[PDB]
């Protein structure tokens, strides 16, 4: 609740700034959508990657190297697939 | 050394808390004074309400929830 | 569509179904069901008509909510006695939610509202693959977790699915809706005997899959949507007519023919218990769902509807469709009558 | 500001689920799911919660509701509250008020269970020698023991990529 | 050749291939695994004393047990 | 020249110099010359809990060395 | 059907995510380790029906380790009794920190 | 005393942002051939005081809103992010020592993406909606890159505590074992602060302005902790705070200095350039910074 | 069903080593050297029976051994042991590489004198 | 029984009824599916934390990433339906009658 105290103080002081600033003076494209879903899927693969610096101290190191390279390799295959197959073109 | 102090402290809370219970529940029918609900004759690890029970708020909040939001 | 992409999507359907078959962890079963959904979505919308788009939308919504209710049942299972072993469950409530999840996964009477709508606006290949693997994938799971199910669940869904696939079914000449209501009735049959001897359920699964493969292969041999197109297939070729005769009669289940063998063994190892009125009710409804088969046969090969010329034009071209494997599946599906003690080939 | 803060944040959580299950316009729905995800993060961090509750925050409140609000912005209009929406919100608040009132002034509330009704400082650790924040080393597996699991997960995401491009006009 | 065509891709393939190969020719991977194994998390649990075994040393000063000496010496 | 811009950057750097130094002063003041004990593990927190338990003042900074042995 | 290539190939690739008491990456237990070990040893060479009707006592012990339902029921009864007797006023309580 | 700590953090942010406005105007003036603002007092500190209080005085935008509550709810979120994002940043002793802070950094950057999107929807008619939609796209396309690069630079140090970072920076700067990764990270900070050379072509303009410049100073402080700096002998924090302030000031001047002289990019060039050049290169640096600590016998003491 | 068998308050009175944490952390290694030989009795009791309320005599034994060790380090050199642990105390979490020269000083004291 | 589990199960029923009854937009249905996902996440995570179920603590994050990519597929399907039509109502879908 200590960071909740900090959040409360920042939120209350921000609301004081806004309300004292206010009481005082008185179609679509598919190309818009492909980038967001590409963000979403590569962000989920980032979520799979990011516990890697947690893991690097174990008694199974070669296997960790192999599957970490497999995860980035799969991410690179997905990238190169949508790269070659006109996924991001104009 | 920390382990020995911890064991003596949790058995201290067990002894004092069952003394408190034996003082406090002599009205209800039934009620053996110190039954484990379990069946096997083994020391189970207590549940932080057997240790920190009826301590009225302050110590149980500073004991259970201490590290959880201490910085 | 690329052919490499279609081989990849078939690889992922097979991967998801084999993960459902082979795993012992609950998360892996849920992953297999979800990956089966994700792969089977672009087999539908193989063309770009809006019919397949709305069908895939309805299918995705029902399939995803079934998947998440399955995950709810598993997290209830670990709210109670918690381990990730595919075994007896530890809650009647969790087993209730789980069997209703799988009943949404594969064609059941309260849950069958997406099946004719998903089959009507799609081509034949997508309907074939969805019926085969989306009626194969939950049966392994039910075969696993049978010993902790309240029986009234399975039996109520089975009875009501057989009678709904019966009664709904007398009204449609859309052949995909006919085959979908047949799928509902047979899935009621194949779920009914789950708690007595599941060897019958898996043998009925084999027989039904081979029968539906024969039927859809006969429809892919000459693209039809209605029965009048089947009368034109009578005009253009005679051997397709006797195939429609034999395969519709083996969907009907008559004792000279191999479609009767799954009914009869169900009645046997059902009536070795104290269940007699339930077999005679189920087999009366099995007499009921033969009538649309029979009027279909009357429309195809026995009476003859008037034909249109340019069939005169189509006479000059011999047939040039490829069949995946039609005749092997046909005589495996229909002349299998004296091989009843290939029952015990299964367990 | 007291002991039952996990229970109170759970009250705000179920209020948020009601607040977008009343079916508003979907950008209000995205707002409700963002508020609900923030207080769910609060609940799981109260159980501590050191990594996973800050981990969900980047995905749902970092990557999913962004695209949900994006698709609300680009696809549907909803250009102008209603009786049915706010009436269901009233009945949801009434059901939560009734359930928590019967939790408060009675022993237990049973849907078909026995929910032992008091705030949860129980159960918890009895101050063990953790030393590595067991979530951390748990998720610091999956690369020694996790052969099959991360392989099928990444493979499913790759197939998700090719599925999305095919439906959105592969190639 | 393709070094003029798409150069950052070729550099990425080159550093990718050396990252694949280079742990094979490596005189330090056994050092990495010894460092990673020789760090204890749990308590080093004792055992019931002896069947008169010439192992499991009694004083922690006794070097009869397996210890670390390449740590201090880089 | 840029002699006329160094007052602006100087005052803004002093505005960036202040909060960490004043924070560290409050850290050293709120424990009597000690540093505030960081806490990342259950081991350090239990050691801190027994330290604040044995102190008698229920305060972990007094640090009670060698004068309660016998 | 359920197949057994998991056992056939000799790669036990999925049996470690499965229960507790399989070896964690740092050798730590769960909260109910020994209850699991005795329950699994109770119901190992068993056809899962005399597991239902014979290992019931140790299974209930394991379940009440895992959720601690009735132990919390006993503690809650103690709390409600303590509240009503301090509402009464007999022995202004020396169960907190002192006599 | 803890609320005194919070107020001693969030009182000098207004001073820092307003004096950053005068510093960016003066530094652009001297990259150009301009003196001033120096008619408003000596060198113009009362000039940011004066225009800040002027924009407070000046009559607000009349609504013209849709869901007044939502319209106020977006900039309140932006400014409370800008306040709540200096909590775990260590100059020598941070406000809250955490188990992990960098994922909190990236999460609050995504909440800034929420601020942009909510102001864009609640703003106005369709053209500003399309403009803010492209802005949300070009903001969200870089949180892949910055999180990837930050992960690969902490992988040399293994832990998330960031006081382990201020320990592990003692011998060499971290710019030397990763220069290209840090360079791409700095370009990603130019992307997240949404300035030139990247295009963006409201209310309250002062609050959106405040969120912008506090985001810039946030990224500069996190840069100065993350990639360079020096040691910290205890019982003397003024030394590290001086060296930290001087390096962060030089880097922020370099930041505005890079802004000063480059034209804005084409949008499809921006997406094209990001994906097809930063994303394979980030993957290359990640796989090499994975396979290299297992090579060189140096995996960090992640306690 | 069955009731527990708690020990009495007569066994729950050992002279507790009410010392602080940083001095106990800095005084760990030589406490592992001279003492901590008869407390693996306690460790083996704790790992052959998972039941404290039983191994408490050996807990009293390690308590008196640690108190005897701190008595022995209290009577002799060093008194700048106090300087060493207060050099290591205020350094956040106590890294042992912090005050290294005085660690060498305390080692030279205890080596040349004890 | 760790009382909070009752509230999170009631929250699951809240999100499930919000998934089932839904008036106009499919986006609200998909977002309540996401809320149901979050409910399962939180409930299972509190269970695994209080169990010290430390070996297989993968369930929260892996359940999360899978059902997140499910939500991604749902977003693409909703974009396709909104692309071939004007809006994305539950209505204007009454074609292909059962």
UniProtKB/Swiss-Prot annotation, chain C:
The chain crosses the membrane at residues 3-23, 25-45, 67-87, 96-116, 122-142, 145-165, 178-198, 200-220, 237-257, 274-294, 325-345. GO terms for biological process: mitochondrial electron transport, NADH to ubiquinone; mitochondrial respiratory chain complex I assembly; reactive oxygen species metabolic process. The lineage of its organism: Eukaryota, Metazoa, Chordata, Craniata, Vertebrata. It comes from Ovis aries (Sheep). It is found in: Mitochondrion inner membrane. GO terms for cellular component: mitochondrial inner membrane; respiratory chain complex I. Its main location: mitochondrion. Its EC number is 7.1.1.2. One of its GO terms (molecular function) is NADH dehydrogenase (ubiquinone) activity. This is NADH-ubiquinone oxidoreductase chain 2. PANTHER family: NADH-UBIQUINONE OXIDOREDUCTASE CHAIN 2. Core subunit of the mitochondrial membrane respiratory chain NADH dehydrogenase (Complex I) which catalyzes electron transfer from NADH through the respiratory chain, using ubiquinone as an electron acceptor. Essential for the catalytic activity and assembly of complex I. Core subunit of respiratory chain NADH dehydrogenase (Complex I) which is composed of 45 different subunits. Interacts with TMEM242. It is a multi-pass membrane protein. Keywords: Electron transport, Membrane, Mitochondrion, Mitochondrion inner membrane, NAD, Respiratory chain, Translocase, Transmembrane, Transmembrane helix, Transport, Ubiquinone. Belongs to the complex I subunit 2 family. It holds the Pfam family Proton_antipo_M. The keyword Protein biosynthesis does not apply.
From Swiss-Prot, chain D:
One of its GO terms (cellular component) is mitochondrial inner membrane. InterPro entries: ComplexI_Subunit6, NADH_UbQ/plastoQ_OxRdtase_su6, Nuo/plastoQ_OxRdtase_6_NuoJ. It is a multi-pass membrane protein. The chain crosses the membrane at residues 1-21, 25-45, 47-67, 84-104, 145-165. Coiled coil: none annotated. Its EC number is 7.1.1.2. Pfam families: Oxidored_q3 (PF00499). This is NADH-ubiquinone oxidoreductase chain 6. The gene is MT-ND6.
Swiss-Prot record, chain H:
GO terms for biological process: mitochondrial electron transport, NADH to ubiquinone; mitochondrial respiratory chain complex I assembly. It holds the Pfam family NADHdh. GO terms for cellular component: mitochondrial inner membrane; respiratory chain complex I. The chain crosses the membrane at residues 2-22, 68-88, 100-120, 147-167, 172-192, 202-222, 238-258, 279-299. It catalyses: a ubiquinone + NADH + 5 H(+)(in) = a ubiquinol + NAD(+) + 4 H(+)(out). InterPro entries: NADH_UbQ_OxRdtase_su1/FPO, NADH_UbQ_OxRdtase_su1_CS. It is a multi-pass membrane protein. Belongs to the complex I subunit 1 family. This is NADH-ubiquinone oxidoreductase chain 1.
Curated annotation (Swiss-Prot), chain J:
It is found in: Mitochondrion inner membrane. GO terms for cellular component: mitochondrial inner membrane; respiratory chain complex I. Belongs to the complex I subunit 4L family. It is an enzyme of class 7 (translocase). InterPro entries: NADH_UbQ_OxRdtase_chain4L/K (IPR001133), NUOK/Mnh_C1-like (IPR039428). Core subunit of respiratory chain NADH dehydrogenase (Complex I) which is composed of 45 different subunits. GO terms for molecular function: NADH dehydrogenase (ubiquinone) activity. Its EC number is 7.1.1.2. GO terms for biological process: ATP synthesis coupled electron transport. Core subunit of the mitochondrial membrane respiratory chain NADH dehydrogenase (Complex I) which catalyzes electron transfer from NADH through the respiratory chain, using ubiquinone as an electron acceptor. Part of the enzyme membrane arm which is embedded in the lipid bilayer and involved in proton translocation. This is NADH-ubiquinone oxidoreductase chain 4L. It holds the Pfam family Oxidored_q2. Keywords: Electron transport, Membrane, Mitochondrion, Mitochondrion inner membrane, NAD, Respiratory chain, Translocase, Transmembrane, Transmembrane helix, Transport, Ubiquinone. The chain crosses the membrane at residues 1-21, 29-49, 61-81. Its main location: mitochondrion. Signal peptide: none annotated. It is a multi-pass membrane protein. It catalyses: a ubiquinone + NADH + 5 H(+)(in) = a ubiquinol + NAD(+) + 4 H(+)(out).
């Amino acid at each position: 609740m200590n960071l909740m105290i900090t959040l409360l103080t920042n939120f209350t002081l921000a609301t004081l700034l806004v309300t004292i600033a206010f009481w005082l003076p008185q179609p679509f494209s598919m190309k818009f959508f492909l980038v967001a879903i590409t963000f979403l899927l590569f962000d989920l693969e980032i979520a799979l990657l990011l516990p890697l610096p947690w893991a690097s101290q174990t008694t199974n190191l070669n296997t960790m190297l192999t599957m970490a390279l497999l995860l980035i390799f799969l991410l690179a295959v997905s990238l190169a697939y949508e790269w070659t197959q006109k996924g991001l073109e104009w | 050394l920390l382990q020995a102090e911890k064991d003596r402290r949790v058995l201290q809370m067990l002894r004092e808390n069952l003394e408190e219970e034996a003082t406090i529940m002599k009205d209800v029918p039934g009620w053996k004074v110190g039954e484990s609900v379990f069946h096997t004759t083994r020391w189970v690890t207590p549940m932080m309400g057997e240790l920190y029970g009826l301590r009225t708020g302050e110590e149980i909040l500073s004991s259970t929830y201490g590290f959880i939001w201490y910085t | 569509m690329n052919p490499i992409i279609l081989i990849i999507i078939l690889m992922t359907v097979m991967l998801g179904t084999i993960i459902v078959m082979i795993s012992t962890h609950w998360l892996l079963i849920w992953i297999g069901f979800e990956m089966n959904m994700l792969a089977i979505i672009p087999i539908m919308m193989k063309k770009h008509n809006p019919r397949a788009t709305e069908a895939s939308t309805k299918y995705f919504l029902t399939q995803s909510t079934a998947s998440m209710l399955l995950m709810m049942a598993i997290i209830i299972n670990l709210m109670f006695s918690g381990q990730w072993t595919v075994m007896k469950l530890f809650n009647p409530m969790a087993s209730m939610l789980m069997t209703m999840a799988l009943a949404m996964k594969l064609g059941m009477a309260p849950f069958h509202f997406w099946v004719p709508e998903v089959t009507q606006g799609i081509p034949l290949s997508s309907g074939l693959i969805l019926l085969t693997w989306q009626k194969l994938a939950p049966m392994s799971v039910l075969y696993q977790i049978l010993p902790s199910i309240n029986l009234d669940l399975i039996l109520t869904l089975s009875i009501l699915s057989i009678t709904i696939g019966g009664w709904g079914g007398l009204n449609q000449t859309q052949l995909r809706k006919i085959m979908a209501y047949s799928s509902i009735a047979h899935m009621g049959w194949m779920t009914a005997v789950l708690l007595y001897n599941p060897t019958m359920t898996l043998l009925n699964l084999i027989i039904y899959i081979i029968m539906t493969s024969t039927m859809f292969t006969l429809f892919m041999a000459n693209s039809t949507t209605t029965t009048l197109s089947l009368s034109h297939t009578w005009n253009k070729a005679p051997i397709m007519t006797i195939l429609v005769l034999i395969t519709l009669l083996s969907m009907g289940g008559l004792p000279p023919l191999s479609g009767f063998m799954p009914k009869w063994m169900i009645i046997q190892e059902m009536t070795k218990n104290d269940s007699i009125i339930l077999p005679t009710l189920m087999a009366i409804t099995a007499l009921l769902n033969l009538y649309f088969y029979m009027r279909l046969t009357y429309s195809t090969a026995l009476t003859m509807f008037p034909s249109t010329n340019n069939m005169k034009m189509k006479w000059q071209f011999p047939t040039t469709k490829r069949m995946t494997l039609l005749p092997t599946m046909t005589v495996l599906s229909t002349m299998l009558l004296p091989l009843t003690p290939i029952l015990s080939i299964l367990e | 500001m007291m002991t039952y803060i996990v229970f109170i944040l759970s009250i705000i959580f179920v209020m948020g689920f009601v607040g977008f299950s009343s079916k508003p316009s979907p950008i209000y729905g995205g707002l409700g799911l963002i508020v609900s995800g923030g207080v769910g993060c609060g609940i799981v961090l109260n159980f501590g919660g050191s990594f996973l509750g800050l981990m969900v925050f980047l995905i749902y409140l970092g990557g999913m509701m962004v695209v949900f609000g994006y698709t609300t912005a680009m696809a549907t209009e909803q250009y102008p509250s209603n009786k049915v929406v706010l009436g269901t919100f009233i009945t949801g608040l009434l059901m939560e008020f009734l359930m928590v009132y019967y939790v408060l002034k009675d022993k237990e509330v049973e849907i078909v269970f026995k929910f032992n009704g008091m705030g949860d400082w129980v159960i918890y650790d009895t101050g063990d020698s953790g030393f590595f924040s067991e979530e951390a080393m748990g998720i610091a597996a999956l690369y020694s023991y996790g052969t099959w699991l991360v392989i099928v997960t990444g493979w499913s995401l790759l197939i998700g990529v090719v599925v999305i491009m095919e439906i959105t006009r592969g190639n | 050749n393709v070094w003029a065509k798409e150069p950052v891709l070729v550099a990425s393939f080159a550093i990718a291939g050396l990252a694949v190969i280079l742990p094979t020719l490596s005189p330090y991977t056994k050092y990495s695994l010894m460092i990673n194994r020789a760090t204890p998390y749990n308590y080093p649990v004792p055992l019931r004393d002896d069947g008169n075994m010439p192992d499991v040393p009694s004083h922690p000063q006794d070097p009869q047990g397996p210890s670390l000496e390449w740590l201090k010496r880089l | 020249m840029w002699f006329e811009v160094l007052p602006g950057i100087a005052v803004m750097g002093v505005c960036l110099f202040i909060p960490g130094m004043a924070t560290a002063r409050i850290h050293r003041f709120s424990n009597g010359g000690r540093e505030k004990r960081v806490a990342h593990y259950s081991y350090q927190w239990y050691l801190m809990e027994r330290d604040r338990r044995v102190s008698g003042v229920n305060r972990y900074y007094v640090s009670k060395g060698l004068e309660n042995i016998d | 059907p359920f197949f057994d290539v998991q056992k056939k190939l000799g790669v036990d690739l999925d049996h470690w995510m499965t229960i507790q008491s399989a070896e964690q990456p740092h050798r730590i237990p769960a909260r109910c380790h020994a209850f699991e070990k005795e329950w699994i040893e109770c119901a190992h060479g068993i056809g899962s029906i005399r597991a239902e009707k014979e290992c019931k006592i140790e299974f209930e012990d394991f379940r009440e380790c895992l959720l601690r339902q009735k132990t919390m029921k006993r503690l809650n009864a103690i709390k409600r009794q303590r509240d009503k007797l301090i509402k009464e006023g007999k022995y202004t309580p020396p169960p907190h920190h002192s006599g | 005393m803890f609320m005194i700590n919070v107020l001693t953090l969030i009182i000098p942010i207004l001073l820092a942002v307003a004096f950053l406005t005068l510093v960016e105007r003066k530094v652009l003036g001297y990259m150009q051939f301009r003196k001033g603002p120096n008619v408003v007092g000596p060198y113009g500190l009362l000039q940011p005081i004066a225009d800040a209080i002027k924009l407070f005085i000046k009559e607000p935008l009349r609504p013209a809103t849709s869901s007044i509550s939502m319209f106020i709810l977006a900039p309140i979120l932006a400014l409370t992010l800008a306040l709540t994002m200096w909590i775990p940043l260590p100059m020598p002793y941070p406000l809250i020592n955490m188990n992990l802070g960098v994922l909190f950094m990236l999460a609050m950057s995504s909440l800034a993406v929420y601020s942009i999107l909510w102001s864009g929807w609640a703003s106005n008619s369709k053209y500003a909606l399309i403009g803010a939609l492209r802005a949300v796209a070009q903001t969200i396309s870089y949180e892949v890159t910055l999180a990837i690069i930050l992960l690969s630079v902490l992988l040399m140090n293994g832990s998330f505590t960031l006081s382990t970072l201020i320990i592990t920076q003692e011998q060499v700067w971290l710019i030397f074992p990763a220069w290209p990764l840090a360079m791409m990270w700095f370009i990603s900070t130019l992307a997240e602060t949404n300035r030139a050379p990247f295009d963006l072509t409201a209310g309250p303009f002062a609050l959106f302005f405040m969120a912008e410049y506090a985001n810039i100073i946030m990224m500069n402080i996190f840069t100065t902790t993350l990639f360079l700096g020096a040691f910290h002998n205890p019982y003397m924090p003024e030394l590290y705070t001086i060296n930290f302030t001087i390096k962060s000031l030089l880097l922020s001047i370099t930041f505005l200095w890079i802004r000063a002289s480059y034209p804005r990019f084409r949008y499809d060039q921006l997406m094209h350039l990001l994906w097809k050049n930063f994303l394979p290169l980030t993957l290359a640096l990640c796989m090499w910074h994975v396979s290299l600590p297992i090579l060189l016998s140096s995996i960090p003491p992640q306690t | 069903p069955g009731i527990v068998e708690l020990p009495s308050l007569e066994d729950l009175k050992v002279q507790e080593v009410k010392v602080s944490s940083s001095v106990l952390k800095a005084a760990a290694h030589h406490y592992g050297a001279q003492c901590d030989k008869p407390n693996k009795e306690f460790m083996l009791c704790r790992w052959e029976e998972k039941d404290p309320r039983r191994c408490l005599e050996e807990g009293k034994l390690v308590n008196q051994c640690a108190l005897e060790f701190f008595r022995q380090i209290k009577r002799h050199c060093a008194e700048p042991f106090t300087e060493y642990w207060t050099c290591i105390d205020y350094s956040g979490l106590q890294l042992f590489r912090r005050c290294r020269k005085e660690q060498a000083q305390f080692d030279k004291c205890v080596l040349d004198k004890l | 029984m760790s009382l909070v589990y009752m509230n999170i199960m009631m929250a699951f029923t809240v999100s499930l009824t919000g998934l089932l009854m839904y008036r106009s937009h499919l986006m609200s249905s998909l977002l309540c599916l996401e809320g149901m996902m979050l409910s399962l996440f939180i409930l299972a995570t509190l269970m695994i934390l209080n169990s010290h179920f430390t070996l297989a603590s993968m369930m929260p994050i892996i359940l999360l990433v899978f059902a997140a990519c499910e939500a991604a597929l749902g977003l693409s399907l909703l974009v396709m339906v909104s692309n071939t039509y004007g809006t994305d109502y539950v209505q204007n879908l009454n074609l292909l009658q059962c």
